[PDB]
Every structure is written in structure tokens, then in C-alpha cells.
Amino acid sequence: KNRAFLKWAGGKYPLLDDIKRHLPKGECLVEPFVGAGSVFLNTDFSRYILADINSDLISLYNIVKMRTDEYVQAARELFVPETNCAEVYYQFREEFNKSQDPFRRAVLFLYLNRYGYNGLCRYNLRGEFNVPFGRYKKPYFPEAELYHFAEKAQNAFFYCESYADSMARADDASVVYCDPPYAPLNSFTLEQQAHLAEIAEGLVERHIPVLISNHDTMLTREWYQRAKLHVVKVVDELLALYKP
Amino acid sequence: KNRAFLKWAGGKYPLLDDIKRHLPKGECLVEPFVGAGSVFLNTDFSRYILADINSDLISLYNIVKMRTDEYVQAARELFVPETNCAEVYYQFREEFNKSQDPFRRAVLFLYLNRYGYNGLCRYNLRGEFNVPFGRYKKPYFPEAELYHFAEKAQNAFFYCESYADSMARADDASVVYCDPPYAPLNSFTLEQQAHLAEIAEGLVERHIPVLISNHDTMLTREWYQRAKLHVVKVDELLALYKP
Amino acid sequence: KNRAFLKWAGGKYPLLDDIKRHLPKGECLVEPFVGAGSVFLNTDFSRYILADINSDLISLYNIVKMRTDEYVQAARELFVPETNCAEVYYQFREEFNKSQDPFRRAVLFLYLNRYGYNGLCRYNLRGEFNVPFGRYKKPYFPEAELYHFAEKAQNAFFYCESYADSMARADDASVVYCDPPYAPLSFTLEQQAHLAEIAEGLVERHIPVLISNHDTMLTREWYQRAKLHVVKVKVDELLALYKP
Ligand SMILES: Nc1ncnc2c1ncn2[C@@H]1O[C@H](CNCC[C@H](N)C(=O)O)[C@@H](O)[C@H]1O
Numbered sequence: 001k002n003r004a005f006l007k008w009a010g011g012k013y014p015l016l017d018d019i020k021r022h023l024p025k026g027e028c029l030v031e032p033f034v035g036a037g038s039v040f041l042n043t044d045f046s047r048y049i050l051a052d053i054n055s056d057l058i059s060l061y062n063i064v065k066m067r068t069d070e071y072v073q074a075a076r077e078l079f080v081p082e083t084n085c086a087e088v089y090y091q092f093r094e095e096f097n098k099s100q101d102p103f104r105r106a107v108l109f110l111y112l113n114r115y116g117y118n119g120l121c122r123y124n125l126r127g128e129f130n131v132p133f134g135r136y137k138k139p140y141f142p143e144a145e146l147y148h149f150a151e152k153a154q155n156a157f158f159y160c161e162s163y164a165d166s167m168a169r170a171d172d173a174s175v176v177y178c179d180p181p182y183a184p185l186n187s188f189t190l191e192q193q194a195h196l197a198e199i200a201e202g203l204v205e206r207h208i209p210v211l212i213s214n215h216d217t218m219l220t221r222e223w224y225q226r227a228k229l230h231v232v233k234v235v236d237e238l239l240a241l242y243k244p
Numbered sequence: 245k246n247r248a249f250l251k252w253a254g255g256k257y258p259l260l261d262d263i264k265r266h267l268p269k270g271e272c273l274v275e276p277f278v279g280a281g282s283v284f285l286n287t288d289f290s291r292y293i294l295a296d297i298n299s300d301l302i303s304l305y306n307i308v309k310m311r312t313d314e315y316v317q318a319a320r321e322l323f324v325p326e327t328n329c330a331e332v333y334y335q336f337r338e339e340f341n342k343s344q345d346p347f348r349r350a351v352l353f354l355y356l357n358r359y360g361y362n363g364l365c366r367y368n369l370r371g372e373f374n375v376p377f378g379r380y381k382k383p384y385f386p387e388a389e390l391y392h393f394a395e396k397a398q399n400a401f402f403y404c405e406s407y408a409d410s411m412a413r414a415d416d417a418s419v420v421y422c423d424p425p426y427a428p429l430n431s432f433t434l435e436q437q438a439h440l441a442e443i444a445e446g447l448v449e450r451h452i453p454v455l456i457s458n459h460d461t462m463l464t465r466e467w468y469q470r471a472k473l474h475v476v477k478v479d480e481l482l483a484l485y486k487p
Numbered sequence: 488k489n490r491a492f493l494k495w496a497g498g499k500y501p502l503l504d505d506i507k508r509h510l511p512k513g514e515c516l517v518e519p520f521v522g523a524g525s526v527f528l529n530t531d532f533s534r535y536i537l538a539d540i541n542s543d544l545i546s547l548y549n550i551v552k553m554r555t556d557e558y559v560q561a562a563r564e565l566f567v568p569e570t571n572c573a574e575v576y577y578q579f580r581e582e583f584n585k586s587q588d589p590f591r592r593a594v595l596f597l598y599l600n601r602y603g604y605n606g607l608c609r610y611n612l613r614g615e616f617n618v619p620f621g622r623y624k625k626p627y628f629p630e631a632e633l634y635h636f637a638e639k640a641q642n643a644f645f646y647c648e649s650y651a652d653s654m655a656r657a658d659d660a661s662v663v664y665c666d667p668p669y670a671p672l673s674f675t676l677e678q679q680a681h682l683a684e685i686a687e688g689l690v691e692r693h694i695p696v697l698i699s700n701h702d703t704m705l706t707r708e709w710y711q712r713a714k715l716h717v718v719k720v721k722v723d724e725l726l727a728l729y730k731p
């Protein structure tokens with residue numbers, strides 16, 4: 001199994017087998033919530049449409065796509081041992097929040113993801129990255145994963161937009177895989193969670209298959225009441241499939 | 245222990261013996277929060293006054309009491325295997341939400357109780373029943389529990405009314421058992437929890453006994469201060485107001 | 488190890504060896520959040536400034552220091568078997584709340600600390616002490632600990648004031664140890680951070696400070712300028728040392 005180069009919530013890990021079992025075939029996969037990219041990275045579609053609300057994430061991605069070699073070399077230089085400390089971390093973090101250059105921001109963003117508290121991505125009320133120092137023994141530099149992601153990215157477009165807009169791009173030959181922020185056990189709201197079920201119902205009426213993952217709860221069975229449902233033991237996980 | 249025909253909050257047994265241990269005796273039992281009816285169905289009071297704010301529940305109970313065979317027969321039809329899919333659950337849920345007929349609604353309510361998600365009874369801001377499909381392999385039709393509930397109901401009256409009105413019906417020959425929505429670890433509010441203790445205090449001074457059960461917490465010991473308390477093992481509390 | 492005579496939130500028992508490992512040396516110890524007094528009671532500074540916002544506590548501690556024998560003798564009489572019941576508990580609680588005599592308040596207050604639900608100190612919106620009856624088997628009368636506190640108080644001043652005023656009393660010869668109310672796993676987040684800002688001001692002036700708290704995203708954010716030490720023990724706890 002191929003790994004994501006970023007530590008990122010639900011690098012959707014234990015469930016790849018189950019998603020691939022239910023994920024229907026087509027020319028194109030659309031992911032309105034790409035995140036880590038683990039589905040993207042472990043499937044063989046002829047092309048991908050990958051979107052996310054997080055503008056840093058998408059920008060990093062476009063940069064790993066178009067400037068591969070220059071990116072990897074520049075970023076390797078921050079995985080040295082002179083950087084594993086707080087004086088350097090809060091330093092790189094102040095630089096990231098004051099920079100207006102995409103390439104350098106993207107270099108700093110990968111250091112923060114791998115040297116920062118629990119590999120989190122968070123912002124204060126002014127929009128500044130505000131994850132504190134994560135005190136790790138030795139952060140892995142993800143060289144192999146960066147290369148594999150780049151190569152694989154040659155068949156992808158990356159958009160920074162809302163799930164409504166990326167799902168409007170899916171067509172005849174598309175499949176849609178949705179992995180939204182999890183339902184309760186600028187946040188993602190219950191209105192949006194149900195909105196996402198509606199868009200899916202509309203895409204299957206046009207014969208575009210949609211698959212959504214989420215926790216198994218009263219609200220998730222309510223919103224996905226029209227999909228074929230599949231509960232998966234490992235808080236249980238719910239897979240909802242809208243087949244034409 | 246005789247079982248309740250409804251799934252209804254908290255698989256309600258884990259207590260019965262301790263309750264009967266402390267629950268004093270008399271002619272008539274008053275339950276302001278009947279819910280599933282476990283106490284009623286496991287005691288031998290000569291008479292019962294049984295009350296709940298939930299009007300779908302009370303209206304069901306009256307019908308099981310007065311139209312037993314007619315009910316059981318209408319309800320058994322909904323337990324055939326043709327009804328055990330998502331398509332039929334949502335159609336019946338919609339039929340119940342749109343119906344103005346107490347008998348048909350009582351029939352659907354048992355279906356929704358036994359085929360819906362975890363046995364819940366919940367409503368949205370529109371007042372509509374909103375529990376989704378439970379996906380159970382083979383739900384049980386509670387025919388024996390139904391008939392037993394009805395033999396016993398022959399000595400009960402059922403009321404749809406808040407705890408203060410039902411407690412006002414107690415007299416010298418009664419006992420009161422109270423099973424409020426639990427204290428914390430359109431909700432039932434802390435002001436209402438306190439108010440129930442105050443009603444118990446005024447009943448016991450009229451020589452009418454009261455037993456209340458709840459979790460054991462700072463607020464529950466506060467509310468129930470003037471009763472004798474027994475803890476049982478999260479921890480449960482029993483508060484007995486003995487004349 | 489010497490024990491506090493009150494049951495009190497964070498009667499810091501397991502942390503003590505750790506706090507002493509990292510706590511520097513000087514003439515005076517300043518505690519802005521003394522509470523139950525464990526660090527006071529298990530160190531040897533030649534002098535102490537002990538502070539807390541809770542005035543019943545401070546008044547108590549002043550009674551114990553300055554009226555030692557009159558206090559033990561009158562407190563002891565409440566620790567009998569006649570008094571271990573709800574009628575008596577509620578009678579005493581109401582007396583405490585209606586009383587204007589510091590002395591008798593400080594006597595009632597220990598009784599309530601030892602007979603009361605989980606040794607809690609709480610007040611309602613009226614400012615009346617509202618902890619209910621705790622139904623204990625036989626509550627212990629902390630005789631030795633009272634004498635030990637009093638002897639030890641001869642080298643101590645107690646003030647009832649907020650952390651910013653006590654901290655300001657520290658000089659060249661002082662060391663400050665802060666034990667604030669716990670970060671989320673009232674005292675506000677703004678106050679949590681303010682504390683850490685004052686610590687930074689003391690260290691620039693050559694005055695050491697140690698802080699203790701839960702290990703969390705936020706505590707690492709606030710104490711980002713300290714040598715940090717994680718102690719295992721139910722979340723980890725953080726110790727934050729501002730050294731010159
Ligand atoms: N409104 C949104 N539209 C598109 N993408 C969104 C939106 N809100 C959040 N996101 C992204 O959606 C992705 C969701 N990660 C979900 C992972 C897992 N199910 C979880 O909740 O931990 C993240 O990358 C977010 O940045």
C-alpha cells in the first residue's frame with residue numbers, strides 16, 4: 001500500500017480495502033475532499049479531479065506537480081538535525097505566516113506538518129498557522145512518497161474550492177468519492193453534511209456513481225437513507241454507495 | 245422479570261430489585277415518568293396511576309388497554325418479512341407523521357419502535373418522528389408482552405401530563421415512584437429536577453411516600469438532601485421520602 | 488512526605504519529586520496559586536509568599552498561623568460521631584454561610600472540607616458555599632498536619648489577590664512556582680496566556696519561574712519560551728521552566 005507524504009487527518013488508512021471493494025470503475029475519479037490523497041494514491045484511474053477547501057494544501061500540491069525536483073531538494077534542507085528544536089520551529093512558523101511566496105510557503109508547510117504537534121493543520125482567528133512544536137525524536141523526510149505523488153499527479157487537476165463546485169465537474173465517465181469531516185460522535189456544518197447527501201442523489205439520477213464514508217450514527221443513516229448502506233467494523237464506519 | 249413490550253430508554257431492569265427493596269407499600273402506585281413500564285409490570289399494586297409527557301406513548305397505552313385483540317391483530321401485520329427494508333421503513337415513518345388517526349398511529353409506533361435505530365424515540369424541530377432505519381436482522385413481535393401489559397392495565401389509568409399534575413393525584417393510600425430523565429454527568433431542565441424534590445417534600449409531609457431514582461452526583465445529593473439516600477453500583481442513587 | 492491538612496484540587500502528591508527536580512534555589516518561594524500548600528509544605532525555603540484568590544482559604548491560613556492552639560482545639564470538637572450526618576452537615580453549612588466571624592467560619596470550613604462531597608470547595612451564584620454531604624465512614628482530623636502547617640507558616644505571608652499581584656512581589660532573591668487551574672483536557676484562556684506572559688517578564692528580570700499544567704496543544708503554545716519537560720502518569724502533565 002502507497003503512503004501519503006503528509007500526516008493528515010484520516011490518511012484514510014484501515015479502510016482502503018473496503019473503499020476499493022465498493023468503489024465503482026470509470027475513467028475519472030473526483031474527490032471533493034482529497035486531504036492526504038490516499039485513495040488517489042492507491043487506485044488506477046486514467047485521470048483524477050482533486051479538490052479541497054484548504055488553499056495551502058492545494059498550492060503545495062500544484063507545486064509538487066509542476067516543480068518536482070526543485071521542491072524536493074529545497075525541502076530536504078529543512079530535515080536536518082539543526083532544525084529539530086523550538087527556536088528553529090517557531091522561527092519557521094513566523095516565516096511561513098509572513099511569506100507571500102507560494103514556493104517557500106510550501107517548503108515550510110511540510111516541515112511544520114512533520115515537526116509540529118501531532119502533525120495537525122490549524123489556524124488562529126487571524127488566519128495564521130498556530131500549531132505548536134511537536135517534540136519528535138526524528139521526523140521522517142518523505143522522499144519516496146513525494147516522488148510517487150508527483151508522478152501520479154501528472155494525471156490530476158487540483159482545485160481549491162467547495163465540495164459543491166468540485167462535484168459539479170463530475171460527468172458521464174466520472175466516479176465520485178467523498179470523505180467529509182466526520183459527523184459529531186468555520187467548522188463543517190450539519191447543513192453541509194446533508195447538502196452533500198442531496199448533491200449525491202442528484203448525481204446518481206444522472207448515472208454518476210457516488211461513494212461517501214463517515215461514522216455510523218443516527219444522522220449519517222438519516223442523510224444517506226437512499227444509498228445502499230455498508231457498515232464496517234473496526235465507533236463503526238459507514239460506507240454509503242449511490243449506484244445507477 | 246416480566247418484560248416491557250417497548251424498547252424504551254435504558255434496558256430498564258438494572259435496578260428493579262433495589263427499587264422493590266426500598267419501595268414502600270400501599271393501595272396505589274403513581275408513576276409520573278412511566279416510560280416503558282418496568283416497575284408497573286413487576287409489582288402487585290391494587291391500583292396504578294401512570295403518566296408521561298409523551299402523548300404518542302400514552303395514547304398507545306390506552307389503546308392496548310381498551311382494544312387489545314383489535315390492536316394486536318393490526319400490529320402483527322406490520323411484522324411480516326415484506327416490511328423489513330429501508331423502503332418500507334421510510335414510507336411507514338412518513339405515514340405515521342401524516343396521520344391523524346390515533347389507532348393507525350399506535351399501530352405504526354410499534355413498528356417504528358422495533359425496526360428503528362437503537363430503539364430510539366426522537367422528534368425533529370418540526371414535531372416529526374425522525375429516527376432512521378435500524379437495519380435489524382429479525383425484530384421480535386412482542387405479542388406475549390402485549391397481552392400481559394393489557395391484563396395488568398385493567399387496574400391502571402393513563403395520563404398524558406407533566407409530573408406536577410400526576411403527583412397532585414396521589415393520596416393517603418398511594419405511593420410515588422419517580423424516574424426523571426437522568427441528571428447530567430426542549431430538554432428536562434435543572435429547574436425541573438429541583439422542582440420534583442420540592443414536590444416530594446410536600447407529599448411526604450402529607451404522609452404520602454415517594455422514591456426517586458437518579459445518577460449519584462453533586463446535584464442529585466443536593467436536590468434530594470431531606471430524603472434517606474442509598475447508593476448502588478456509573479453509580480445510581482435512591483432517595484426515599486418516608487413519613 | 489508531608490501532607491496538606493485540607494483535601495484540595497491538586498493536593499499535588501504524585502508530581503512532587505518532579506517539581507523538586509526542576510524547581511530552582513533562592514531565598515524566597517512565591518506561590519500565586521498556593522491552594523493546599525504541598526510545595527510550601529515539602530520544601531525548605533528560608534521564606535515564602537503564599538497567595539490565592541479564594542478568601543475563605545487565606546483567612547483560614549491566617550487563623551491557623553496566628554491562632555494555632557485556640558483553632559485546633561475548637562476544630563477538633565466538630566470531628567465527632569454526632570456530627571457525621573445530613574441534619575448536622577446541613578445545619579453547619581448554613582451557619583457557615585450566615586456567619587460574619589472569621590474564626591468560627593474557619594472552624595466550620597475545615598469540617599465542610601472533610602465531611603463534604605469529594606472534598607470539593609464550590610459556591611453557587613449567590614456566593615454561598617454549596618458542596619453537599621459526602622457520607623464518609625469516619626473523616627480524619629488532620630491534627631499533626633495542622634501543627635506542621637502552623638510551625639511552617641512562621642516563615643510565610645499569606646495574601647488574597649490575583650496571580651498578577653502576587654507575582655509582582657517577587658525580587659532578585661525569589662523563585663516562583665505557578666499551579667494554575669488546569670487547561671481544558673472560571674479561569675479563562677486569556678488568563679492562562681497572561682500568566683505565561685508575566686513569566687517571560689520575570690525571567691528577563693533574572694527571576695526564575697516554574698509552571699505546571701496538562702500537556703496539550705495550548706499549554707505548549709503558551710509556554711513556548713520555556714525548557715519543557717513532559718512527565719508521564721489520564722493525560723501527561725507538563726512542567727515549564729523559565730531559566731535565566
Ligand atoms: N466545505 C469543504 N469543502 C471541501 N473540502 C473541505 C470542506 N471542509 C473541509 N474540507 C476538507 O475536507 C477534508 C476532510 N478530511 C476528512 C478526514 C476524516 N473523514 C476526518 O473527518 O478526520 C480536509 O482536507 C478538509 O480540509
Ligand SMILES: Nc1ncnc2c1ncn2[C@@H]1O[C@H](CNCC[C@H](N)C(=O)O)[C@@H](O)[C@H]1O
Binds near residue numbers: 406
Ligand atoms: N416534564 C415531564 N413530565 C412528565 N414526564 C416526562 C417529562 N419529561 C420527560 N418525561 C418522560 O419521562 C420519562 C423519562 N424516564 C426515563 C429516565 C431514565 N432514567 C433515563 O433518563 O434514561 C420519559 O418517558 C419521558 O417521556
Ligand SMILES: Nc1ncnc2c1ncn2[C@@H]1O[C@H](CNCC[C@H](N)C(=O)O)[C@@H](O)[C@H]1O
Binds near residue numbers: 520
Ligand atoms: N485568578 C487567580 N489568581 C490566583 N489564584 C487563583 C486564581 N484563580 C483560581 N485560583 C486558585 O488557584 C488554585 C488552583 N488549583 C490548581 C490545582 C490543579 N492544577 C487543578 O487545576 O485542579 C485554586 O486554589 C484557586 O482557588
